[PDB]
Symmetry: D2
Subunit: 295 residues, 4 copies
């Protein structure tokens, strides 16, 4: 299994565009997907956290997945977010996404209900048992309120269909050892730690700021891969203001406001997420100009 | 607004009983509701966290609410959990619960997606606007990954339908000041802090261990309310092993295993929650014997 | 052993007054000690955290202890802070304080170096063996970077000289069980949790805000003791602004600036602690007016 | 100012050897210093955290510094740990260390007392003003209970003697931006993050596991410096078991037990730190064999 070829190296956790009435806008979704791949992404995650998976319906997730596969599926990998805090629901979503032709699944730690580690294991195993797709665990305790503990990640690595981890936990030392011991592929799921994750052996990024700076993140991956760490560091510093704006706004608000500033209107977030205020737009524009992604 | 009369003073966040095949068991739900009210609860919350709100459908929640209202609605207050991380969904569920005849709503902080405080305010206001029912905010950052900050609670207090807070944040000092300044009623949402919350002015408990020890928690409330803090303290120590077991197991696993030990089978949890192991059952039984609610 | 009589019920963790040249001001220490006892304290802790134990010498600690014993030792209990992160030093200081006539010892968890629990346990028992004085553990992981875990506290309880705990860890449920199981006396070491700790069985307070509001805290203890929880709650709200100021400033800065505002100059802190800025004094005076301890 | 030449690139935060009766063992300190430099360290920190700075006297620290300077000062850089939670004491120690011929100073964030940021700034400025030596800030909030906030680091960067940071805070993103903006040199102060810190631009390591594996850490620095990240990553994995053992034991217990296993007896720790148990020695020996530093 060639993870870089099968899932990608630079993915955006793409926003889900909404029309002015809040409804799903698949035409803009196809335009945005083409834009992000043209800028350097070789894969996309649809209905990740940044895609507002909490506020879209099953039917909207499937419509979006279909539109993005049609738009870019012949030249980029399209990974479907399919996990929730409900194992039966997650299985239904995984099967539906496989039926549409998703290239892989991203499955987040069940949030809010804080299952024990053996419940996390049974959950992820049940989802991995539901389809033949390659599956990435998505470890984000800062959102889900429980981590996937290292012993649990290691147990899940023995599943033939679980191929890697999108990490937003930042235990770089543990991830390095898991990668060495199990061959799971790691993706950085926190843009601030993209470069440290590459140092520890990560395959690539599942990025939020790639909405705005995909070309530079592609240059960073290439520079690092060729051993030119000084250039990778310089690019990382160049895009650092975008990580700073992400910390202020969150990925959903940042991505929808930033794309608008770049001339790609993707609508507003759905409640309880909120659109950036005029003052926040002004501060975001300043960071984007500093990062050379806005005139 | 007489919160103690309209919502209760001892509520159980009732489990949702499932049959052996995992389906909803409304017959057992009615039997359990009657048991908990006969043992001392003057209200019940249906489809709270402990009721496995993540893994039940809208239709199951409504069918359960109807069954519990028909069983105990003439002699106890029935509060419906109606909040998720999706504002549009939360509004639909609140309206459906009001149409069934719920006496009040429990609305948790949107989990996982980490909206900003102004998004929380818009979310809670939208849900509070949706029906004429009294509403409790449910502040549990250890599950939802964001708190309701005190400025946000104070802003929401002026909504005519928002009457109180189920607190699982444990900021007793902040809650005391909010109670004093706004008149919001507070309920303890963490059995470990039941007695500290009463000292600070809380109206009562929305309890997990009341599944097993409702009679003693009623005595605790009566002892504290009569001025016999020493006896309230002794009762709190008596039921402390149940709080310890809840820390080990979580409320869902604890409540379903403990009720089975007491002879009221309510089925097992739905994944990703899990039934207690044999070792956990033995340790739980020991705590229940220590708390005089078994054998 | 009568802890309330031997150690007290309302203690101030007294500041150490410094003269204009920075030296120890024992005349002001005696004046302050008399003031705090006259206002309602029945004991004092000298060279606690609030007494700037980090920046005073052993000789200054002994001179302060001597001055306070002379001033109030016949009508109040004087407890000496004697613990550091160095077991040999802690033993030396404990012996010197006992030789001066201290009535008891306060011994903080070794800070910074993060010993394992068995090292903490060896440390505390070695200090407890050094003198025949009664000793309080001081559990403050937010400062020392490690807690005294409950199994460790329970093991230390069987030492005859270890009679209680000054708690700044806020695990009210664990402390309640430890008091019931072991008979250790608890003192609130966090003013915001004074009333919760009383509800769980604490003997009293080792207080910072008693520098400014000792009379009201004595009234709180009396009201709680007589079962007038409504009055205790009302006093607790009345002094809450002082707790808020303490959260902004820390105890050392708050106590020295607040005493100065009340007309009792005790000098300024030693670096790295700092005196309140002009705007901090303005904000502190507002909280003191709200708490009725400043005109 | 050539930080790599003036302070080094691979430093050990060297243990302080004690004799059987616990007294300072300067002959063994000189022997250990020569060993660590021969193995690849080009500098040493004496009386850091791992050097048991909490439990040694000023006189012992100066005797140790004198002995280590005599042993290796002509061919390695000898940095003196000079910071405590007492600014006046820290200044005395810094001046005494400069008088002995130390090549630089390592100054930890004042621990336990939680000064505000302006107090930290005044503290570090006062210590930096006390000598002509180059000085490293040591940011370790997990031990000291307060961080050096980025604004504070940036303010201190302007001091001519403050030349860099030993980081154990792990905010790699902030450290990268600080290095870019100020030119401060960063050293990894947590072996688990050595490789990520190099990726972000760190100058080298102030290491604990270098007591046992200095040769491999030197190879790691050399491979990374030459752009051979794959080899650096493989060496980092090879020594990862030592980082795991550090997490279980702490640096003081690990280093003294591991050196003894290698045939370099440096005595035992001073209370409250403790010597490894037989079971801990067995588990440590397994990790050392895995890392190829024990037969
Ligand atoms: Mg939904
Ligand atoms: Mg659902
Ligand atoms: Mg209305
Ligand atoms: Mg209201
Ligand atoms: Mg000293
Ligand atoms: Mg004795
Ligand atoms: Mg004892
Ligand atoms: Mg000392
Ligand atoms: Mg400088």
């Amino acid at each position: 299994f060639d993870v870089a070829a099968r899932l990608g190296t630079l993915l955006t956790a793409m926003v889900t565009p909404f029309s002015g009435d809040g409804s799903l806008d698949t035409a803009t979704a196809a335009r945005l997907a083409n834009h992000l791949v043209d800028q350097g992404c070789d894969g996309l995650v649809v209905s990740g956290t940044t895609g507002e998976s909490p506020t879209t319906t099953d039917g909207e997730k499937i419509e979006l997945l279909r539109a993005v596969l049609e738009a870019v599926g012949d030249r980029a990998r399209v990974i479907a977010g399919a996990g929730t805090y409900d194992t039966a629901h997650s299985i239904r979503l995984a099967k539906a996404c496989a039926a549409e032709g998703a290239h892989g699944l991203l499955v987040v730690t069940p949030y809010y209900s804080k299952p024990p580690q053996r419940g996390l294991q049974a959950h992820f195993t049940a989802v991995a048992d539901a389809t033949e797709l390659p599956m990435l665990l998505y470890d984000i305790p800062g959102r889900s309120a429980v981590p996937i503990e290292p012993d649990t990640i290691r147990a899940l690595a023995s599943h033939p269909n679980i191929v890697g981890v999108k990490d937003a936990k930042a235990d770089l030392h543990s991830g390095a050892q898991i990668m060495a011991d199990t061959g799971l592929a790691y993706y950085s799921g926190d843009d601030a730690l993209n470069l440290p994750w590459l140092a520890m052996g990560a395959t690539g990024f599942i990025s939020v700021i790639a909405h705005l700076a995909a070309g530079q993140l592609r240059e960073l991956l290439s520079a690092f891969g060729s051993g030119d760490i000084a250039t990778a560091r310089k690019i990382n510093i160049a895009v650092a203001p975008l990580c700073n704006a992400m910390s202020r706004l969150g990925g959903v608000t940042l991505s929808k406001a930033g794309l608008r500033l770049q001339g790609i209107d993707v609508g507003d977030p759905r409640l309880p997420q909120v659109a950036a205020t005029p003052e926040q737009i002004d501060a975001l524009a300043a960071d984007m100009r500093a990062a050379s992604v806005l005139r």
